[PDB]
Amino acid sequence: LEGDDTVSEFETKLSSAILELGMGATAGTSDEAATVNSNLVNYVSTGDVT
């Protein structure tokens, strides 16, 4: 980590690192894998509160 990154860059780096270890979604030849890998690590901003 460096002193000029963005929070979204932090999320992308963490997602790549987690997917590197092998904990990611199965390659089922389907978009399910893409969506699941998209929704691993997330950040909640002001407009997306549930």
Can residue 3 be called a binding residue for other proteins (CB under 8 A)?
Answer: yes
Can residue 4 be called a binding residue for other proteins (CB under 8 A)?
Answer: yes
> Which segments within the chain are labelled E, that is strand?
none
Segment contacting other proteins by CB under 8 A, of 1-9, 19-27, 29-37, 40-48:
1-9
Q: State how far the Cα of 44 lies from the Cα of 41, in Å rounded to an integer.
A: 10
Where do breaks (C to N over 2.5 Å) occur in the chain, by preceding residue number? none
Can residue 20 be called a binding residue for other proteins (CB under 8 A)?
Answer: no
Residues contributing to the site for other proteins (CB under 8 A) = 2-4
